[model samples]
Target chain A: PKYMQIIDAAVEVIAENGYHQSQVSKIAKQAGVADGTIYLYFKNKEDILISLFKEKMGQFIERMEEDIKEKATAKEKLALVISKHFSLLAGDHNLAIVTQLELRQSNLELRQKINEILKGYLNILDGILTEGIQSGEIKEGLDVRLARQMIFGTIDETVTTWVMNDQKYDLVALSNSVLELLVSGIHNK
Target chain B: PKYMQIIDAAVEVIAENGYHQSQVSKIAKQAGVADGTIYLYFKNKEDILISLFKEKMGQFIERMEEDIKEKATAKEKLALVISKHFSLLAGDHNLAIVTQLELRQSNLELRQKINEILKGYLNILDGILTEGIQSGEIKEGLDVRLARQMIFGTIDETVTTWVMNDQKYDLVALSNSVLELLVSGIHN
Candidate 1:
């Protein structure tokens, strides 16, 4: 669809030119559509950005939701989540740049919008934590909110570091270690 | 003394006005000084920010270094680090808003400068991780870099969440739970 074409083009343009510099006309040109066509789909550049996240993140969550359903244990589900999350960004450099850096340069209003979209992803994480506790895989008396922050925070910092380093390392390969750190604690037993 | 006075005023103005909306005149007025005094201390708005972080974070690290000197174990030191980090931000609401939210809104170039200032803090964390390993306290063969990321990342995320939630909750109270998760993994 033209909407998706514009969305994909916006990612490329924003990645190349940055969030502030990437204008609507450039996105239109990149998408190979008339400038007016963008207005037909999105209200403005911010709308395109919000829609871009909704479309990309929407698919991202959908795939993870489908894939995790196959695993029975929370630990296994978490492993898959980490691996999938790492690989997805690893597979797309431009998308990683946009999501990790460029999008963050937006103002507070847009930041809030992005956070609202993120609740879906966080809810999925909360579900995994709930299942982990219920099945006795995760430690008892763990604060689910704190644990979720740790998991998400660690993963986020790892990815942001990778992106900041110009994606020079094997992000996917580090998935198991990241999972181990989260699952096994940092202290020696 | 005026340098610090201006720096403190920057934090207040930036916190109240947001980064982009803040200007030199406003910061100077807030500091009860003439506008020229700001330029005498800082090159521009960006310089003020970098210096703000350096002065504030420098004192922050110095205090932590001093306090942790009395601790005999890595776990104790780690606890102190988390507690100090949380309470420092919790104690200063304006600084919390400036660090956690406003500063993040700056351009990429400014972000890089802030990251440069952050290395001092990260080095202190690395020192703790190294001591933990050398003393057989933390697990063996742990990747120092990744573990550091997890510790810093979790702390940073926790604080950012609190700031985002309007600082209504008791942020310092969560320090122990946060430290516990960092020391002990989520698994049973």
Candidate 2:
């Protein structure tokens, strides 16, 4: 419980204060623990950041995996994937800031670590692409990697833009339109 | 000439040594200019980055605009845009590293300033999208802003992945396939 508490506090602190501005003591204060208590839970500031991302991203991916199984078609599965992704972030303001904004603000090594954790989410996407190819639902010889990049990147950018705009619009509402754009693409020609 | 030299030096230093590792003095040394000479042209370190981006991305957008004029169709224009973009970065390894990797590592204020300059490039994209919609070549009511985000983001991520991979593969060679993906959407 304390571990989870520290993680939550870290997200709130980092989101409220930019990651560079956030300190371990601040996170501990937010968590209602002594400054020294943070050291007991985390090795240092970077560790808290890495662990927070890992923990949050891990749970999100796991949940996405379990929920997506209920959808039948590749297209439908993708809709569910995106829907859950947006709403999950939409449901938590701080988590959205942490995931979309603060996390990317970290240094290269931290970004690389985040990328490694991201591969699991990508694998889930890859599985869907493979299934779509096999099922003849998606086009044949799809460059799964590039397509994944487009999907993930498009979704990622959309969310980042929303967060940057102060989350003024309904992220969940835009999910369908984005899904349509992703599925049908823009080139109507 | 000195301005161009400083921009080149910035890219080289930032490319060779990561963003955080590259300092103003080192950049000045690389440019072969007195460290104070830099201040005459720009404000500070962040100014150099924003200016460097403006210089490079401006040239890219200008070239694309001129070349794309003869393409005659939105699809052709988009292909040209993607091809030139990939090849430009592929042609310059140091520039690729600076733009794709180092530039992103800057702070939020720096990023916003960068975004201001990026509006020029994004406007180039907007022009293409606008032309497509006007020509009925793209989806009617394509939500230009969202589409722009998708186009920019997809291309950006592809280049980023290539850079991260140490340019092992031919970045330009993937242009048509990526174009196909972007043009046809993902359903195909």
Candidate 3:
């Protein structure tokens, strides 16, 4: 549990400085722990980076899963999914900056680890899409894979634009517009 | 002039090493000249990058302009514009890579200069949209900027996807598909 404190510090450090620049000792210092103490809990910087995702992202999905169960309709569940994603990024400025701003650090291996953690999030979205398709909420014959990419790509683009724009705009405002574009193609009148 | 030779070599260097990794000295070596010789033509690396756009992209627009000269109908001109765009990028792999991939490395200042050169490209597209509205080809109520961004964004996405995928798909093959989506919307 104390080590979780260290990861929270590392998230801040990694958010401000990129993944490459966020040293283990910096994280330890931020956590108010000694440099050598971190090594006992984690192997190295890369290990911290991967574990950070596995940890924070696991919490994210776990919470969303619980929250989604409270909703009755598939449409409501889908909206909750979109709101949770943007709101989570919006709530914690540190995680917002990490998720929004400084994650792409020109490191390939760390990215792969991040991608692995992303599998959980992807599965959750797929479950929502399956529900919607079965209940006739979303259209039939919609390719789940293509639909995922479109939703992911559009949201990713919008958030990136927001983050890249220095968090100036209301990200949550675009949640519905983006969700609308996702469920019903933007071309739909 | 040797200016032409150096700029051409710059394209080669950018494509080979990628945009971020490309250096002024590397470009000089590729051009078969001294590192300092690049300054003889370009003001700096920024100049080299924008010059590559001006040199290649100028001719690119000029050729496309001429190709659609005889299309009397606005819809025909619009279709021809899309066709020529895909055709040119498809014709030259080196240019495609340099344009689609390496050019993005131009930092804020360089991007502004590239955007300046891009006015001609954008204007050409705008003219088509305008003409289509006048001649009743495209819908009269279309939001020109959003419509243009949709077309531009889709094309840019498709091209970047191709480059990221190492050119696996036939890029130009989707020209019709992209155009249809932009004008007609993908509601169907």
Which of candidates 2 and 3 is the stronger one according to DockQ? 2
In model 2, the runs with Cα more than 4 Å from the true position are A105-107, B102-108
lDDT of 1 by residue, A132-179 (tens): 888898887799988999999899889988987889999999999999
DockQ of each: 0.64, 0.58, 0.15
TM-scores for chain A over all candidates: 0.97, 0.95, 0.91
Off by over 4 Å in 3: A1-7, A14-55, A69-77, A105-143, A186-188, B1-23, B41-165, B171-188
Q: A1-189 in candidate 2: lDDT tens per residue?
A: 889999999989898887877898899899999988888878998889889989988898889888888988888988988888999888999998888767763245666776777888889888998898888888766799999988988888888778877788998988888888888888764
Candidate 1 lDDT over B1-188, as tens digits, reads 89999999999988776676688899999999999988888899989988888888768887887888799988888899889989889888888878776444326788788888777777888888898899899999999999988988899889877877778899889988888888888988
Evaluated at residue A22, the lDDT of candidate 2 is: 87
Query: Which 10-residue window of candidate 1 chain B scores lowest in summed lDDT?
Result: B99-108
By TM-score, the better pick of 1 and 3 is 1
Compute fnat per model: 0.69, 0.60, 0.02
Tens digit per residue, CA lDDT, model 3, B1-188: 87988888888777776554579998888889898888888898778878889988877777767867788865566667667776777876667777765433314466567767766776776677777777666666555543454445455555655555557677777666555444443222
RMSD list, candidates in order: 1.8, 2.0, 5.8
**What is the CA-based DockQ of model 2?**
0.58
Q: What tens digits encode model 2's per-residue C-alpha lDDT throughout B1-188?
A: 89999999998887776666679999999999998998888888888888888898778888887888899877788899889999989988888978876544326688787777777777877889998888889899899889888888888889887876778899999998888887777775
